[PDB]
Design a protein around this ligand. Structure first.
Ligand code: CUA
Ligand code: CUA
Ligand SMILES: [Ca+2]
Ligand SMILES: [Ca+2]
Ligand SMILES: [Cl-]
Ligand SMILES: [K+]
Ligand code: NA
Ligand code: NA
Lengths: 585, 586
């Protein structure tokens, strides 16, 4: 009954959980140890990472596709793939609001391995994964209403071909599965524990562009998706396509008051934000934001709603507790309590879901258990394993936007305050203030035993298989060869590396040549990573044990130009260098 | 000594970590070791728009075309041997730059590509009477000119140079040609002398060649002689650079006026001035030693009063395998990393000096195991005459099993060690990304920051001048200025509203958006992102920020505020409407 968990992870001790933090406007994903809250690793995704060369290497730019031209991202929602309502540790997915992308991270290597630009939408916000029977789909919200086509003839958001869409990506192939046109817009989303239903909040049911217009409606809604019905329509070929994308597009809008078979619109106050599935699978809980409430949709009633048995879509609302000012997000301890951020009141409120349901019926019962002050203005919060039926009720992180005086001053820009709260007992206890850069917004925690990683690369890894293919065309055995291939004004250097020596320590090219350098790290000892930097050429990349990495640049400067290993790898690290000699034109 | 900083408590020191090949500078609270801020320098930062905004690309100059850096050595400006908290400087080995960070705004405000060199490694600041010069090493020998006619490092015109940058103007002050090459460097407590380690006295390019000589050296610089030669006009220039270049190489075994070469084993690395100003201490690396150069013997060495440059060595303690770096507790002890033995060794400098004279004494006080393979180490205030002997950070290169597994790439292990007492105590393992090389710690009361920008800050003064040419008052105006195929949008922002919430352009127009954050409440930052155009920047209270992009896509394109600023933040958005090219002249 007492919240008494230990927070200190001393030298030589290990954390109990992995934390996966969104990088916010900075674009990466960050791996933390919990409860120490120390950052263990940064995984580049939408950012360009000077250290590993993500965004510069051929392997990374191949994964990014055309979107490799962008140097920014804005991510919010990191989530781990599931099997039977539990994390399976295979993949992490995350959104990019800035350039309308979804990325996939492979948790065995802790790298982004797939990326997709969602077609015919703007701004991927809410993102969550199918839970049951497993993560077949990644569900993603496109936040902003746009014209279709967006060819510059029509700009009116109220035109009948202006709308946004709910997006489903095939988690395993990272290709679009389908899109569903909706009324209004989309904010956050979550999925049930059966695979049939998903739901999303909408704050712009008004289809307005101005602040006041977007707050005009007493109620917006959460739109519920009958995913089985969508899938059936796709299997039967009953869909359209938009523009030059082959993605099946289904119309989920209400037409002359008549409901689609793919959607129902449940009225909810007001400009709601969070959309959170309780761990017992009973509820979609929408945070009321402008309304000081959360609304509880009984997932049990959704079949009746779509079958036309209910006289009113509000009939699926079974609770609407009053909690405080500015409810934004909800999480669960698995013991029957919900925990909700109050942005305005600057608190986390713990409340009992079944008691709120009884109060909605008129029973006099206080469902509120505790309000804990947080510092300050909390956005999202996350309890350990809360997105699974294994929600364990141990740790809670509340991610607050204004850190004010909680840390040393560091200039006009301030850190986020991610506060660790012990929820193992009856009383929430604040135990740690964690400053973070660039507004992570949301995070996710997994048990140590849910994550299994590779100590060294497999030579057949798909991450650099296209580079292995290029090498094959050149007759190159990457595991052994140190050779320079000349092909017109193209030069392809292939080399092994073994601390403390590059396998090719000098090569000569002609000014203007396009040079590709492919390096295979044939060290077998864990942690013996190498780097490759070409001085004054903007070239930098990582090569970890048994990885092949490659990078392309033009030798636009005559003369002698040094390259060196950037990753401290050996006592003779500083002498691990080579020379590119560039003959003048 | 308090180790843990609980909720609502503040750290006692600022830590400034280098970002290594990730390219940024990181601000930590010490002793919590939590990262409080990232300061982009050579990296492109999606969050603040550094490398994307016009203000940042102006500071970076032509080097804005590079997306990478490799920084090692962050150091704070000094007055009379003490931190004054004005500036932090750092190197870029990848693209041969030095950057200046202003500590009041915690932003890079100046950057310079060092001319006619490759790879800025070691960097240190003049201590006395203040930081007039930033001293920086160019690590790699190159031909001069480097035009592709000569590649041979043995050519009489192949060399590297020592570099002095004017700390206040961030322009080159001078360069000194040296024999061998340059690694790390430090400066004395008088202003006359600086010193640097050399590991490639052989001028080789292969591993064996670079390891051939039993001793390389530390080259000592007589800055007073350099300055006097510059004022006398006795110098040359290289290429198109106007920087005074002085020749500090030997000529047929005869010394120049500017340099002396002190033989030191072997491929030495660290070059550290003791806090009492007595010694330059060189870490022997391949030699299991450190070599102590008595700074008060330097005047005699430069005046020819000594028969052998080795005569300025007054200690060479044997310490262990792979000495890389030394720091100081201000109590007469030195602390040295042993990369191979994977330890920090605490030793007494005066007793090492007496053991050098033959007197049998054990100057080694303790060896603490670290995990694993330490590179540099830093004691609090160690680079100043206020070295307070409280905290030590050792930065280890192989973390192995000290943290949860995270795949083939591992974090570094920066370990906080309590040195307030006679015995070193390991207290905290701090994992860090991308290999910080050095860090620096400053007392909390040595750093003073602003919470609100001044409207005349030089950081964005070029943007203010741009606005003035358009007749714009940035504090108030919400206007769209049109100029051919250029559109310049000026707007204020006040949560939760952009001052200009929609504007219309032609397909192909080059659009500049300038935003002034006119909120006065601290911590109320705004952002600006144009969806699907690769555009992102921060605007903090009273800052002006601007960014330029091509409106290459017809149709409606949303922009939004990225920094959570207000309960209605999600609704702080705007719309750019792009009329299609086929409806406008071709
Ligand atoms: Cu390879 Cu350092
Ligand atoms: Cu301005 Cu959020
Ligand atoms: Ca609304
Ligand atoms: Ca040597
Ligand atoms: Cl949510
Ligand atoms: K390392
Ligand atoms: Na893709
Ligand atoms: Na389109």
């Amino acid at each position: 009954k007492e919240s008494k968990q230990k927070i200190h992870v001393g030298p030589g001790e290990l954390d109990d959980y992995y934390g996966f933090w969104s990088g916010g406007h900075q674009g990466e994903v960050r791996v933390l140890g919990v409860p120490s809250m120390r950052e263990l690793m940064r995984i580049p995704v939408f950012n360009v990472d000077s250290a590993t060369g993500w965004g510069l290497t051929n392997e990374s730019r191949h994964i990014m596709g055309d979107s490799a031209k962008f140097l920014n991202g804005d991510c919010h929602h990191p989530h781990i793939s599931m099997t039977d309502g539990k994390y399976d540790g295979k993949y992490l997915f995350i959104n990019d609001k800035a350039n309308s992308r979804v990325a996939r991270i492979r948790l065995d290597i802790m790298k982004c391995d797939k990326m997709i630009t969602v077609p015919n939408v703007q701004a991927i916000a809410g993102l969550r994964l199918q839970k049951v029977p497993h993560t077949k789909y990644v569900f993603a919200n496109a936040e902003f209403i746009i014209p279709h086509p967006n060819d510059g003839k029509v700009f009116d958001l109220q035109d009948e071909n202006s709308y946004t869409m709910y997006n489903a990506i095939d988690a395993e192939t990272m290709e679009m599965a389908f899109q569903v046109i909706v009324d209004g817009n989309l904010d956050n989303t979550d999925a049930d524990y059966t695979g049939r239903f998903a739901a999303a909040t909408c704050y712009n049911s008004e289809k307005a562009f101005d602040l006041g217009g977007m707050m005009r409606n007493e109620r917006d809604w959460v739109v519920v998706f009958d995913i089985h019905a969508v899938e059936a329509a796709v299997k039967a070929g009953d869909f359209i396509t938009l523009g030059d994308s082959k993605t099946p597009v289904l119309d989920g809008r209400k037409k002359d008051g008549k409901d689609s078979k793919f959607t129902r619109y449940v009225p909810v106050p007001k400009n709601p934000h969070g959309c959170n599935t309780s761990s017992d699978g009973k509820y979609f809980i929408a945070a009321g934001k402008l309304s000081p409430t959360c609304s509880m949709i009984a997932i049990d009633k959704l079949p009746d709603l779509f079958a036309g048995k209910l006289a009113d879509p509000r009939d699926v609302i079974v609770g609407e507790p009053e909690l405080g000012l500015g409810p934004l997000h909800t999480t669960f301890d698995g013991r029957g309590n919900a925990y909700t951020t109050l942005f305005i009141d600057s608190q986390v409120v713990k409340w009992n879901m079944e008691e709120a349901v009884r109060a909605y019926k008129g029973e006099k019962v206080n469902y509120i258990k505790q309000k804990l002050d947080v510092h300050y203005q909390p956005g999202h919060l996350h309890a350990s394993l809360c997105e699974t039926n294994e929600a364990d009720g141990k740790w809670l992180v509340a991610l607050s936007k204004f850190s004010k005086d909680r840390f040393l001053p560091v200039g006009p820009l301030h850190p986020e305050n991610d506060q660790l709260i012990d929820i193992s007992g009856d009383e929430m206890k604040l135990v740690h203030d964690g400053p973070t850069f660039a507004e992570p917004h949301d995070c996710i925690m997994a048990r140590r035993d849910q994550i299994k990683t590779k100590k060294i690369w497999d030579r057949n890894d798909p991450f650099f298989a296209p580079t292995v293919e290029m090498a094959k065309k050149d007759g190159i055995n990457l595991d052994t060869d140190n050779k320079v291939i000349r092909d017109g004004n193209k030069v392809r250097v292939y080399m092994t590396s073994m601390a403390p020596a590059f396998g090719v320590q000098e090569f000569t090219v002609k000014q203007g040549d396009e040079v590709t350098v492919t390096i295979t790290n044939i060290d077998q000892i864990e942690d013996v990573s190498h780097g490759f930097v070409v001085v004054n050429h903007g070239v930098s990349m990582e090569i970890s044990p048994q990885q092949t990495s490659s990078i392309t640049f033009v030798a636009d400067k005559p003369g002698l130009h040094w390259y060196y290993c950037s990753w401290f790898c050996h006592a003779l690290h500083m002498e691990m260098v080579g020379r590119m000699m560039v003959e003048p034109a």
